[PDB]
UniProtKB/Swiss-Prot annotation:
Protein name per its UniProtKB record: Envelope protein E
Disulfide bond positions: 14-44
PTM section of the record: N-glycosylated.
Membrane topology: Multi-pass membrane protein
Covered residues, full protein: 572 to 683 of 3411
Subcellular localization: Virion membrane; Host endoplasmic reticulum membrane
Function according to Swiss-Prot or TrEMBL: Binds to host cell surface receptor and mediates fusion between viral and cellular membranes. Envelope protein is synthesized in the endoplasmic reticulum in the form of heterodimer with protein prM. They play a role in virion budding in the ER, and the newly formed immature particle is covered with 60 spikes composed of heterodimer between precursor prM and envelope protein E. The virion is transported to the Golgi apparatus where the low pH causes dissociation of PrM-E heterodimers and formation of E homodimers. prM-E cleavage is inefficient, and many virions are only partially matured.
Assembly mode: Homodimer; in the endoplasmic reticulum and Golgi. Interacts with protein prM. Interacts with non-structural protein 1.
Length: 112
């Protein structure tokens, strides 16, 4: 849903070599929390997606933390995202340089 940035209100995704400084982990609040990295070449709006596919063509999840830019070429922003109940694939980036991490989220019957 909102995981891919604000439609017509925000700039392009990083496609230089990305990674997580911290991989997504469940918060116990219905969300997964992470820290992502940029290195060179790429002024970008910070690209953290939640998908039905390991390579993020689909956009299924919600941003919980804000969507800034990289303030430097080396920037590293801290984000919570929200998947639905069931599976999701958490992606960092666009182009070949994008990384992926699998999550499953429990039913809304327990709400964590």
């Amino acid at each position: 849903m909102s995981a891919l940035t604000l439609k017509g209100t925000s700039y392009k995704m990083c496609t230089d070599k990305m990674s997580f400084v911290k991989n997504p982990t469940d918060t116990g609040h219905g969300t997964v929390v992470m820290q992502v990295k940029v290195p060179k070449g790429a002024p970008c709006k910070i690209p953290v997606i939640v998908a039905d596919d390991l390579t993020a063509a689909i956009n299924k999840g919600i941003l919980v933390t804000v969507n800034p830019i990289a303030s430097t070429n080396d920037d590293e922003v801290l984000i919570e995202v929200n998947p639905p109940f069931g599976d999701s694939y958490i992606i960092v980036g666009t182009g070949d340089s994008r990384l992926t991490y699998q999550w499953h989220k429990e039913g809304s019957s327990i709400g964590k």
